Amino acid sequence: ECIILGQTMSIGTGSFKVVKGTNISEKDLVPKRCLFESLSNEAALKAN
Amino acid sequence: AYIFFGPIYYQKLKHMVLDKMHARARGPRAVLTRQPTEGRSRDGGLRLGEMERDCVIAYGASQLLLER
After folding, report:
1. Which residue of B has its CA nearest to A5?
2. Which of A13, A16, A17, A18 is best to mutate for the B interface (most B CBs within 10 A)?
3. Oligomeric state and partners (chain A)?
């Protein structure tokens, strides 16, 4: 019933999957940030 | 070796190759059409039966199934 619907069978060649590695490091996947939430953090909990 | 030589009454039949070369690329009304004299001789044709679907399962090819 995979040849009727046109699906790939799960035996033989389609018994696995191949995927491609991105080969990227965590040095490029950083949450880059320089003086964004510093203005709103100090003047929100002072004396209140 | 001494080779057996002599005349034999041969005879030429029907069923030449010129009217059996049948091919098809894409779409109906195939481009290489044989002569329309079959006469209770439909031997499958340009098809892919259930016996031939079971052969490529035994090889384990999954994308040739989707291609054919």
Report:
1. B66
2. A13
3. Component of the RNA polymerase III (Pol III) complex consisting of 17 subunits.
